[PDB]
């Protein structure tokens, strides 16, 4: 019974690696979107003035 | 050449119905090699 868990833990980690990149890809994007919004807000604050 | 006399056989089934009910089995083949089996089984579980 001790083999079968082991061999599997290994592979599922590669699947968590697939998600891992994509999460940083979304991190990259959400930090873009934020900055998009900050620059637009920075503009509207200064234009308010 | 003997099929006519094949299903027709002497030492067929009389070992095995009262053969769940018994202990002492292969066992002498076991005893020596069971001691060898006991230690090995421990070692292999350990590193897993």
UniProtKB/Swiss-Prot annotation, chain A:
Signal peptide, first to last residue: none
The organism's place on the tree of life at top rank: Eukaryota
Record's subcellular location: Cytoplasm, Myofibril; Cytoplasm, Myofibril, Sarcomere
Family the entry assigns: Belongs to the TRAFAC class myosin-kinesin ATPase superfamily. Myosin family.
Note: The cardiac alpha isoform is a 'fast' ATPase myosin, while the beta isoform is a 'slow' ATPase.
Assembly description: Muscle myosin is a hexameric protein that consists of 2 heavy chain subunits (MHC), 2 alkali light chain subunits (MLC) and 2 regulatory light chain subunits (MLC-2). Interacts with ECPAS. Interacts (via C-terminus) with LRRC39.
Disease linked to the protein: Cardiomyopathy, familial hypertrophic, 1: A hereditary heart disorder characterized by ventricular hypertrophy, which is usually asymmetric and often involves the interventricular septum. The symptoms include dyspnea, syncope, collapse, palpitations, and chest pain. They can be readily provoked by exercise. The disorder has inter- and intrafamilial variability ranging from benign to malignant forms with high risk of cardiac failure and sudden cardiac death. Congenital myopathy 7A, myosin storage, autosomal dominant: A skeletal muscle disorder characterized by prominent axial and proximal weakening, spinal stiffness, severe scoliosis, with or without respiratory and cardiac involvement. The age at symptom onset can range from early childhood to late adulthood, and disease severity ranges from asymptomatic to severe muscular weakness and respiratory insufficiency. Histopathological examination shows variable findings including subsarcolemmal hyaline bodies in type 1 fibers.
Task performed by this protein: Myosins are actin-based motor molecules with ATPase activity essential for muscle contraction. Forms regular bipolar thick filaments that, together with actin thin filaments, constitute the fundamental contractile unit of skeletal and cardiac muscle.
Domains: entry comment: The rodlike tail sequence is highly repetitive, showing cycles of a 28-residue repeat pattern composed of 4 heptapeptides, characteristic for alpha-helical coiled coils.
Protein name: Myosin-7
Naturally occurring in which organism (per UniProt): Homo sapiens (Human)
Phylogenetic classification of the source organism: Eukaryota, Metazoa, Chordata, Craniata, Vertebrata
Gene name in the database record: MYH7
Complete-protein stretch covered: 865 to 913 of 1935
From Swiss-Prot, chain B:
Domain of life where this protein originates: Eukaryota
Subcellular location field: Cytoplasm, Myofibril; Cytoplasm, Myofibril, Sarcomere
Note in the entry: The cardiac alpha isoform is a 'fast' ATPase myosin, while the beta isoform is a 'slow' ATPase.
Subunit structure: Muscle myosin is a hexameric protein that consists of 2 heavy chain subunits (MHC), 2 alkali light chain subunits (MLC) and 2 regulatory light chain subunits (MLC-2). Interacts with ECPAS. Interacts (via C-terminus) with LRRC39.
Annotated domain remarks: The rodlike tail sequence is highly repetitive, showing cycles of a 28-residue repeat pattern composed of 4 heptapeptides, characteristic for alpha-helical coiled coils. Limited proteolysis of myosin heavy chain produces 1 light meromyosin (LMM) and 1 heavy meromyosin (HMM). HMM can be further cleaved into 2 globular subfragments (S1) and 1 rod-shaped subfragment (S2).
Function, in words: Myosins are actin-based motor molecules with ATPase activity essential for muscle contraction. Forms regular bipolar thick filaments that, together with actin thin filaments, constitute the fundamental contractile unit of skeletal and cardiac muscle.
UniProt disease link: Cardiomyopathy, familial hypertrophic, 1: A hereditary heart disorder characterized by ventricular hypertrophy, which is usually asymmetric and often involves the interventricular septum. The symptoms include dyspnea, syncope, collapse, palpitations, and chest pain. They can be readily provoked by exercise. The disorder has inter- and intrafamilial variability ranging from benign to malignant forms with high risk of cardiac failure and sudden cardiac death. Congenital myopathy 7A, myosin storage, autosomal dominant: A skeletal muscle disorder characterized by prominent axial and proximal weakening, spinal stiffness, severe scoliosis, with or without respiratory and cardiac involvement. The age at symptom onset can range from early childhood to late adulthood, and disease severity ranges from asymptomatic to severe muscular weakness and respiratory insufficiency. Histopathological examination shows variable findings including subsarcolemmal hyaline bodies in type 1 fibers.
Record family assignment: Belongs to the TRAFAC class myosin-kinesin ATPase superfamily. Myosin family.
Name the record gives this protein: Myosin-7
UniProt gene name: MYH7
